[PDB]
Design a protein around this ligand. Sequence first.
Ligand code: CLA
Ligand code: CLA
Ligand code: CLA
Ligand SMILES: C=Cc1c(C)c2cc3nc(c4c5[nH]c(cc6nc(cc1[nH]2)C(C)=C6CC)c(C)c5C(=O)[C@@H]4C(=O)OC)[C@@H](CCC(=O)OC/C=C(\C)CCC[C@H](C)CCC[C@H](C)CCCC(C)C)[C@@H]3C
Ligand SMILES: CCCCCCCCCCCCCCCC(=O)OC[C@H](COP(=O)(O)OC[C@@H](O)CO)OC(=O)CCCCCCCCCCCCCCC
Ligand SMILES: CC1=C(/C=C/C(C)=C/C=C/C(C)=C/C=C/C=C(C)/C=C/C=C(C)/C=C/C2=C(C)CCCC2(C)C)C(C)(C)CCC1
Ligand SMILES: CC1=C(/C=C/C(C)=C/C=C/C(C)=C/C=C/C=C(C)/C=C/C=C(C)/C=C/C2=C(C)CCCC2(C)C)C(C)(C)CCC1
Ligand SMILES: CCCCCCCCCCCCCCCCCC(=O)O
Ligand SMILES: [Fe+2]
Lengths: 30, 82, 341, 33, 32, 34, 505, 65, 38, 34, 57, 37, 115
Amino acid sequence: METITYVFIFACIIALFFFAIFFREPPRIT
Amino acid sequence: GTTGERPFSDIITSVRYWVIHSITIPALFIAGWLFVSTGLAYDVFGTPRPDSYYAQEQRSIPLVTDRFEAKQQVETFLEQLK
Amino acid sequence: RGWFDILDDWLKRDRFVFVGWSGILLFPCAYLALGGWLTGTTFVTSWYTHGLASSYLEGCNFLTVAVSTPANSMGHSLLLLWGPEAQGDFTRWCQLGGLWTFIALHGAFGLIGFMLRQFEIARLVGVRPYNAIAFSAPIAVFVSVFLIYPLGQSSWFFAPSFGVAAIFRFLLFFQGFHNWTLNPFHMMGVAGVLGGALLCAIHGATVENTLFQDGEGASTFRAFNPTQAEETYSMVTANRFWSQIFGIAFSNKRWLHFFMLFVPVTGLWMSAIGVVGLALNLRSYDFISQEIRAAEDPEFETFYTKNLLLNEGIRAWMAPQDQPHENFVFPEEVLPRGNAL
Amino acid sequence: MEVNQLGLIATALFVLVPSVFLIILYVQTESQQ
Amino acid sequence: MEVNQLGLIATALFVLVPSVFLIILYVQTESQ
Amino acid sequence: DWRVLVVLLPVLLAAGWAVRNILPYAVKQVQKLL
Amino acid sequence: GLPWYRVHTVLINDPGRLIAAHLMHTALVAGWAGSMALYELATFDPSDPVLNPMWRQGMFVLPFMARLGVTGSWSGWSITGETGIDPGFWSFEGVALAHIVLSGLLFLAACWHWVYWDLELFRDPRTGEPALDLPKMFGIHLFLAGLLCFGFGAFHLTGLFGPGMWVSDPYGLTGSVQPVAPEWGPDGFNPYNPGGVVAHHIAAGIVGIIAGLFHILVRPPQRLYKALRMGNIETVLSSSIAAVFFAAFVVAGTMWYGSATTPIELFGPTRYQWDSSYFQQEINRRVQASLASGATLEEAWSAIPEKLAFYDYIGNNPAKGGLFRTGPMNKGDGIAQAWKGHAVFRNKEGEELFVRRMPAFFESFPVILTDKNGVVKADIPFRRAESKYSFEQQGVTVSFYGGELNGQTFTDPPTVKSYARKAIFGEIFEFDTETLNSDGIFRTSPRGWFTFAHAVFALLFFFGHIWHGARTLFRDVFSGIDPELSPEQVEWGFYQKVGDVTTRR
Amino acid sequence: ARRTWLGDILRPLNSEYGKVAPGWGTTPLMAVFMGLFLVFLLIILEIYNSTLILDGVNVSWKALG
Amino acid sequence: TITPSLKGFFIGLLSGAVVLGLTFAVLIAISQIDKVQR
Amino acid sequence: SYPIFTVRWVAVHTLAVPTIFFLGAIAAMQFIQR
Amino acid sequence: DIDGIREPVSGSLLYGNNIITGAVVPSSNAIGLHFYPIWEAASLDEWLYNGGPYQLI
Amino acid sequence: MEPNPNRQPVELNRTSLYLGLLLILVLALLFSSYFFN
Amino acid sequence: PLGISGTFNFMIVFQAEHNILMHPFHQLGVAGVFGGALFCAMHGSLVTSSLIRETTETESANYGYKFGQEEETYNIVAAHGYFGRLIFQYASFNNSRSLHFFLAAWPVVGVWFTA
Ligand code: CLA
Ligand code: CLA
Ligand code: CLA
Ligand SMILES: C=Cc1c(C)c2cc3nc(c4c5[nH]c(cc6nc(cc1[nH]2)C(C)=C6CC)c(C)c5C(=O)[C@@H]4C(=O)OC)[C@@H](CCC(=O)OC/C=C(\C)CCC[C@H](C)CCC[C@H](C)CCCC(C)C)[C@@H]3C
Ligand SMILES: CCCCCCCCCCCCCCCC(=O)OC[C@H](COP(=O)(O)OC[C@@H](O)CO)OC(=O)CCCCCCCCCCCCCCC
Ligand SMILES: CC1=C(/C=C/C(C)=C/C=C/C(C)=C/C=C/C=C(C)/C=C/C=C(C)/C=C/C2=C(C)CCCC2(C)C)C(C)(C)CCC1
Ligand SMILES: CC1=C(/C=C/C(C)=C/C=C/C(C)=C/C=C/C=C(C)/C=C/C=C(C)/C=C/C2=C(C)CCCC2(C)C)C(C)(C)CCC1
Ligand SMILES: CCCCCCCCCCCCCCCCCC(=O)O
Ligand SMILES: [Fe+2]
């Protein structure tokens, strides 16, 4: 159960990487 | 800007500056030297001299072990040398 | 227009070194903590508190000199020069460890003084007081390590001594006795310090390599004026660079600089909290599940079990000389050793 | 391994409670637009 | 009583997950 | 004891010498203070 | 909108909803107290305060109820082991119920004050703007604080009209709620003198009353009202936080060193009592006193109360714990059942040997037996090949006097090494490890867990002091410095005095 | 705003917002009490620390009996 | 009754008064001579 | 028209004077034999 | 077997490690500085024993 | 009785979401080993 | 090793075999990394201290800055004037190019040495 927990949190972090790069609030100028 | 103290680069290239400090600077170096060379520094601070870390046939540290008798313990440890 | 306001005027004059009301506390205290360290390190032994030489006068060099903690027998005595231990004898005070409390205490009050100075100058000049705020981090570290930690233990003796190598020994004490690397609060400290040095390097480099051409010459420093209103580098080209290199960039120069405050301050505050627990020997020493399996299963070995053999070595080999008041006698046959070494 | 059984409910809530807080605040920010 | 350990986590998530869904949906209704 | 005058004497002459050399220019500074 | 970290600033000029929030906080805190007690009562074993006191079972609020006089349960037991008693309503159970009722009444009040926020009371009658006369409220609240502080000392603590407080002998053997008389002498400042606790509260009580009187009638000086922004409620938060972390440092220190208000039967021994062999000295004093009047060894040791022998054991040292080793101390070494006896080691020569005790710093420690004179005479060797001092070679034996093994002597080396291993912990106890599935690793006491929490909170609240005080003195630039700050100001030598534009040169 | 019986009664205690004594008012007397209080905290601290040792004051558990 | 450590306390207290008061004497004087002009 | 003795002046010599004195002391020390 | 002494060290989660104690363990001292790609091993079981993944990573 | 004038909308933008999520997930990843012990 | 505890193993054994604490290049690394953490916080505290008022107290100060705005968002002379008085005038920067190069160079160089 602890192995499932460590790997699940890691996988959630990798998923958040994906959204934060490809689905970010785009920076716009002035 | 500036606060109206005299600039450092003016002072230290000044003649009067180097007239005072060519005496003051070495005099302190020599005073500090003598503080050591006379052995006054050993006595002021209580620092063991190379010959006074241990008693001769002795190899235990004179280590303070009481809070309130600590002063007297150091002093007894010293009489173990004279 | 009484004497208070006249003294306030004189303290707050613009001079080469600003004084302020906070300089009354800061300037004697900082001077004296610093003088005490140089005085002890040049002239003062540790023979009677530790069994160590610790001064230049005795043959030590810059790396081995220290003002050392008092003997364990002084408990948490303030070790005032006029108090019952040295009884006003300056020599016995020096020999008994008195300069340690001197330095540490005038240190504590100097750090207050300095931080009040940051408040005081910030109020007079009209800026927000975040530099002071950030300086709470160094204060937390100092008080937690030099004051709170030995107060939970038996005595000042176990605080860090003021010296390069004495601190190194403190670092290694904490590994073997407290297993301090295993502590998450230290780990978050490490991540904040290293995170800071990272952000420092990466931010200086970004600015310096997104500079606008504002002068003709090859030295690009000259083409900055402190009074220009224009930003001197392109936040936009920096954002593109880092978006495409790393996937995310900063986009808000205010967030960026707040983040540079936040990261290292936080990290230090975190390690401080961990030390507070180590004051009580509330260590992050073991993982129970590992010890249970390890004990039952002689084939189970992890880098965790390997590191505690190391700490166990440190303890047994270092303790008699580091804790001489305990008269630890470990005959050869009881010292933990692996094969041949 | 002989790991503590509330480790799991501790870890799950440590994650879920503050995550849900932030999600709630974000979603209702975006429907203000 | 010798009950199921996972019963606590199953009960807690059973409450927590669907409740949070409703709370998310309701608060963003109100703020528009 | 004696070592204390040995040590102290360079610094007395040192502060004697600077005082002589600077005494004129120092009197100006203080009079300007009203 | 507001950032998440500022949602609660909507209360800064809403005295009514500020009150409702303070009521809600006070409800939650008193609800916790009731919930925590009920949980403790449901998991507490009252059946052996010698070897399973509250402090071994991880009880945290029990001891604070007992400290002030709540000693018994409606089930008939009391924490001194007195049985058949009737505590009336102020039992553990009744105290827990009182706080939950309180919690629920406060929650209803909060609803009222959140709804009827716009009370005329909160309005300045001059301007119509909401405002709190902070200086006069301080005198009001101070005067109440002094009344209560006085009453608590004069009536609860004296037993003039109350139970007293927990007092004990120096070795933690005979504690009980007793009325305490005030110590007005200089020994009332002795942390270890309970009568000084009574004096403190009487005298500080009267000073609080006198000072509250002063602060209700005397307006603050103008210099001071401007200096400290006494029309800004956040300056009260800044100073309040400072006073709070001062207090948190004090209570963590008295909990760790020990004082009359942290007796060891409610909280456990301190680490210093192990450092200085405090119970061991006294145990030895008593065995010598027996031997003097010619009591056999068996008899002199049998006279040692098991409760005193249990204090002389490193497993109750609050400095043997770990941050993530959770639960009661009982979860570690187990539930103490019996003192096995005091263990006496001798070599084949008849010399008596002594186990060198483990110090609190060491998770592990070698087994080294010394003679009266400090000279090492046996150990358990790590490397066997050059071993000189082994139990096998030195003929070491263990004899027990007192306890469960009184009169018993073991000679076979694997047994003698076994008790030698436990002897570094001090006195040797029989534990039950099956019941709580104990894993055998020491945990800290409530003395330790309290000190740790309060030392950490104190430090954190110090940064809140710094934050909220910075925010008071610099309110005017919270959002940023003036965009028309001109470089003549922050540059050197334009003004004689820094920031004073009237000192221009 | 809403008037209430209890409010009308407590009314005068929240009526002098803003009011000050002039200049320094009592500030010198405050200062005397602070200094007194610090010495007092000092003695309490140094007693607990056994840096101040008074007659008949045995800063140990052995003072409980 | 009036013990060595209580005599030392008073030596400390006096020493501190002299240092703080002597410091402030000097500060008040300088500030009176050397004033800022408005 | 500069003052000689100022606050700055005192800060410097508060640091500079004992530095040199300590420097001469440490100098002597290199010549100590056991 | 990081140190060549046929004393294998468990680094991975399924073998009783947590996030703190787990590692990819360095390759065997028996290999020293020799290049140990997968195709030099008789099987992946051997390559795993001797620490091949660390060299690859 | 007038409705309360001190209400204010609260905001969490998307970058603040990603940052907080990341902080909580890495915190969880760090402390979990210690909760299972 | 590629693991958290493995890292600690390697740095413990390194110290027994090399006394890296007493090696000067590690000492510069500490100075490089303690130093960069310090200046990180300095630069971020001093910039944050001298932001120009653009917002109200109900809003994050960060909305004072818009991505790609041409004017600076803090006043570096107010910043120079604070830090120069905290220490003394010439121990503070007022060329932002030299300041950021210093930020870049201190930790990079110290980490070169420890490498
Ligand atoms: C403001 C600057 C400052 C501050 C904050 C401190 C702070 C401290 N010093 Mg340091 N010191 C200073 C300046 C300062 N010092 C200076 C300028 C020197 C050079 C002489 C020294 C030299 C020095 C030494 C040599 C020692 C200290 C020590 C100490 C500590 C104990 C002080 C103590 O017990 O106070 C007690 C006294 C007070 C707090 C003063 C109280 C003032 C009250 C308000 C006035 C009372 C009036 C009076 C008694 C009435 C007289 C009546 C008359 C008619 C008889 C403390 C950390 C000791 C230390 O570090 O121990 C390890 C120590 O041994 N100091
Ligand atoms: C001042 C607070 C306080 C104190 C000192 C104690 C002390 C105690 N409690 Mg109580 N308790 C409290 C509050 C407190 N409690 C509260 C608020 C609750 C309700 C949640 C409880 C509920 C409770 C139960 C249900 C039980 C106890 C038990 C116990 C005992 C064991 C404690 C233990 O193992 O902790 C272990 C401590 C830890 C594992 C430390 C946790 C802190 C982590 C490391 C930090 C969290 C991460 C953080 C976010 C850091 C990153 C921030 C960064 C971004 C800045 C002990 C005597 C037990 C007992 O023995 O019962 C009789 C028991 O079963 N307590
Ligand atoms: C009585 C103590 C007290 C009080 C009433 C306040 C009140 C306030 N603070 Mg201060 N503060 C305090 C202590 C206090 N603080 C302490 C000890 C610190 C140091 C940690 C701070 C540091 C601090 C900062 C740094 C800031 C404030 C701010 C504020 C304001 C907005 C807070 C808000 O919306 O939070 C909103 C909080 C949340 C929405 C959730 C946070 C949850 C936290 C992280 C952890 C979980 C808490 C847990 C459930 C309960 C705590 C238990 C424990 C304390 C017993 C408000 C006036 C802000 C401000 O000034 O705005 C102008 C601001 O920026 N506070
Ligand atoms: C060893 C590491 C280290 C050192 C030496 C250090 C040094 C300093 N930091 C300062 C500032 C800061 N530090 C900050 C963040 C950080 N500081 C950190 C780490 C350090 N910071 C870290 C990691 C961070 C990131 C959070 C900030 C944000 C600031 C500032 O604003 C401030 C500054 O001006 O920066 C340029 C200065 C304040 C000096 C002072 O108070 O003068 C007065 C001197 C006094 C009061 C004497 C103190 C006495 C000390 C405490 C005890 C005695 C020490 C002995 C003299 C020396 C013994 C040393 C032996 C062990 C070798 C000073 C240069
Ligand atoms: C590593 C940092 C290097 C940054 C370099 C400079 C940043 C740029 C400065 C902006 C204006 C440009 C001038 C640049 C050029 C510049 O750097 O000039 C260095 C400066 C020159 O001062 P003068 O007035 O002599 O200037 C002559 C020049 O005008 C030549 O043109 O020297 C000093 O400040 C010496 C100070 C030693 C002071 C001795 C110690 C005093 C003790 C004080 C105690 C400390 C305070 C306590 C607080 C707790
Ligand atoms: C303690 C005490 C006190 C005080 C004192 C004092 C305050 C002191 C001071 C002191 C000091 C004030 C000293 C100083 C010294 C110094 C030194 C000794 C220095 C040295 C340095 C050096 C060595 C440097 C060099 C270098 C190098 C090496 C490299 C780089 C470059 C340079 C140049 C930097 C009193 C009386 C109050 C009383 C009590 C006791
Ligand atoms: C309505 C009402 C009622 C009812 C009442 C009730 C039933 C109450 C309850 C209440 C309660 C029952 C409460 C409780 C509370 C709780 C709480 C408040 C808790 C706390 C928590 C905390 C805060 C925690 C935290 C933490 C954690 C979690 C982890 C570790 C760390 C810490 C410690 C931080 C009555 C009948 C009276 C009457 C009528 C009205
Ligand atoms: C906050 C103010 C604190 C400043 C106090 C500094 C005190 C100055 C040190 C004075 C010590 C001189 C006497 C030392 C002991 C003399 C011998 C004796 O006890 O009779
Ligand atoms: Fe920048």
